């Protein structure tokens, strides 16, 4: 919530790999299925790109009755509005007063989808260059 920065990674090159593997140039036909969760370096042309859009990460809700602003975390593409109060003061109370949303205290991210395509000479004989989706965020 108080993250001023954005954390990112980069792999090692082949020159640091021969000098004492993890970063190989991978095709989208060379995905096999079981590489879901490994860091991969894919080479290809980019045909489809989208516009930069703000995607929320955490939804901030404010109340006038208690003052304790709550924050929920979303992970999927969609979500539901938490109209019921889950604060630490409304649990020991008869009243369950209305909550509102804040578009300023909520943390957003510059989300963008892209379609990477298979390279022309890396595709096999007769096959077509199928695509894959890349979801980028931040800078």
């Amino acid at each position: 919530l108080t993250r001023r920065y954005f954390l990112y990674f980069k792999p090692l090159s082949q020159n640091c790999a021969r000098r004492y593997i993890s970063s190989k140039p991978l095709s989208v036909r060379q995905i096999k299925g079981d590489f879901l969760g490994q860091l991969i370096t894919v080479r290809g042309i980019i045909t489809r790109v989208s516009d930069v859009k703000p995607a929320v990460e955490v939804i901030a809700y404010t109340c006038d009755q208690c003052g304790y602003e709550v924050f929920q975390e979303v992970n999927s593409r969609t979500f539901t509005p938490l109209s019921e109060c889950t604060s630490e003061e409304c649990s020991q109370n008869q009243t369950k007063g209305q909550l509102f949303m804040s578009t300023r205290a909520s943390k957003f991210s510059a989300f963008q989808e892209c379609k990477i395509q298979e390279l022309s000479q890396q595709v096999p004989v007769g096959h077509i260059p199928r695509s894959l989706n890349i979801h980028v965020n931040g800078t």
């Binding site: 404010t62 003052g67 304790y68 602003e69 804040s102 300023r104 205290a105």
Partner: protein
């Protein structure tokens, strides 16, 4: 000391300094904002518009 959640704005202190700026301002930007007669710059406009 009243503090709103996620806001560094106090009500009464900003109320008093906004009233102190509104009752006393005579072209200070002409004297210290750059190197470049009147009296009561905000009292006359507020007394005119009503």
């Amino acid at each position: 000391l009243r503090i709103i959640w996620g806001t560094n704005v106090s009500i009464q202190e900003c109320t008093t300094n906004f009233r102190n700026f509104l009752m006393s301002f005579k072209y200070k930007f002409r004297k210290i904002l750059d190197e470049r007669d009147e009296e009561l710059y905000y009292i006359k406009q507020l007394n005119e518009m009503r």
